[PDB]
Design a protein around this ligand. Structure first.
Ligand SMILES: C=C1C(=O)O[C@H]2C[C@@H](C)[C@@H]3C=CC(=O)[C@@]3(C)[C@@H](OC(C)=O)[C@H]12
Ligand SMILES: C=C1C(=O)O[C@H]2C[C@@H](C)[C@@H]3C=CC(=O)[C@@]3(C)[C@@H](OC(C)=O)[C@H]12
Lengths: 10, 215, 215, 11
């Protein structure tokens, strides 16, 4: 859920 | 109201606060999924969670969290909503576009009621905070840890509700008896988006597109 | 208890009380619906509403209501449910007939959740009441009355929660909060039924086919 | 126009 993840990481 | 406070639950609300219309809404809707994440970073203890959980919670509650955020926005607008993209959208614009049925439902069922009780920004964040913390969500690693957080939130609200509107005893339950609608609206609301994807003539962006993806 | 009496709602609860699993769960439903109307009669001030307004309320909530009835009746059984018909439907049985997804949802979402808090028949008859007085129901001639009457059923339930269960402050909120899930399950329960009829594989008896037949 | 249910709400 590539985008969601990317936003949550940083 | 120390572990989980209304005071911040307000900050996390102040900070994110903002041509065939079924498109204008859907764009607005993509743009929003981004800021939604910034909000969820500020509703306390969401982050502390396993990141695997922050994903499940959000995929399952984006529909309702978003619908609720706009409806609140549209207290001023008479018979239409106030989308984050700046445009105002009237019920007829909605009707002419084949979506008269659910748009009317958001207005009747959610906005009017918001306006009738003059529901405040804190009250909203809290209702959103509750929505975010859904223990029923499948695949949640510690569904109880969530169960907990909804429980602290919904307490901090009553403390508010009892405080700020002392002449208003039924407010807390009134506030919470709009959720089953929120859910109800969200399901059918969702039902379309899949349709607009299926028939293929409505533009749908990357983020919005990710959410309409099979778990 | 001045206008809405806790007991009386509870009286009505006590008062109404009892190969292809799927076929069975249906025989049970048409049978349950008959008894449901009477239950409804038995609730304070229901019968004081014009029949037409009554029929919309009953048509509006037949799934949510009978659902939470059978959920509570099932706080005893291990994995499965007990029908009004007196059969048992085990999880394995349900799964084998293609309806497991919903089945676990009832069991996870409602039965364990109910069972956990040891919800009483009063609290059940009380929630069922807030369902029935859904002022958001379509075609409802006086929405003001139904709305308040829910304001009654709930000021009444809160008060009781404090009395019987003062040790747990958050009881009131937790109970109202299974109502969205209740909403969610009922709608998904409806769909399945339209499909059975659409197929015509599953015999559906008259009262049911009636509640599936459109307004 | 849904007979049986109306019939059941007389008594
Ligand atoms: C609230 C929405 C949201 O966040 O996303 C969009 C999703 C679609 C599917 C939904 C269905 C018809 C619609 O018009 C809209 C676009 C919006 O709802 C209304 C009626 O405002 C809805
Ligand atoms: C909840 C129900 C209800 O009130 O009526 C029945 C409707 C049938 C069609 C439905 C479809 C699939 C299902 O499993 C069942 C059989 C039931 O769900 C449960 C609990 O079994 C469902």
């Amino acid at each position: 859920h590539k985008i969601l993840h990317r936003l949550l990481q940083d | 109201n120390e572990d989980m406070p209304v005071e911040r639950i307000l900050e996390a609300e102040l900070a994110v606060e903002p041509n065939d219309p079924v498109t204008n809404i859907c764009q607005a809707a993509d743009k929003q999924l981004f800021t939604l994440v910034e909000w969820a970073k500020r509703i306390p203890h969401f982050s502390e969670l396993p990141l695997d959980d922050q994903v499940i919670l959000l995929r399952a509650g984006w529909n309702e969290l978003l619908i609720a955020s706009f409806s609140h926005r549209s207290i001023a607008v008479k018979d239409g909503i106030l989308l984050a993209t700046g445009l105002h959208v009237h019920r007829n614009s909605a009707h002419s576009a084949g979506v008269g049925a659910i748009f009317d439902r958001v207005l009747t069922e959610l906005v009017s009621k918001m306006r009738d009780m003059q529901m405040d920004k804190t009250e909203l964040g809290c209702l959103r905070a509750i929505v975010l913390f859904n223990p029923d969500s499948k695949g949640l690693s510690n569904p109880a840890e969530v169960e907990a957080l909804r429980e602290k939130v919904y307490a901090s609200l009553e403390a508010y509700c009892k405080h700020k509107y002392p002449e208003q005893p039924g407010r807390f339950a009134k506030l919470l008896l709009r959720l089953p609608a929120l859910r109800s609206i969200g399901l059918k609301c969702l039902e379309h988006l899949f349709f607009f994807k299926l028939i293929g003539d409505t533009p749908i962006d990357t983020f919005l597109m990710e959410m309409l993806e099979a778990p």
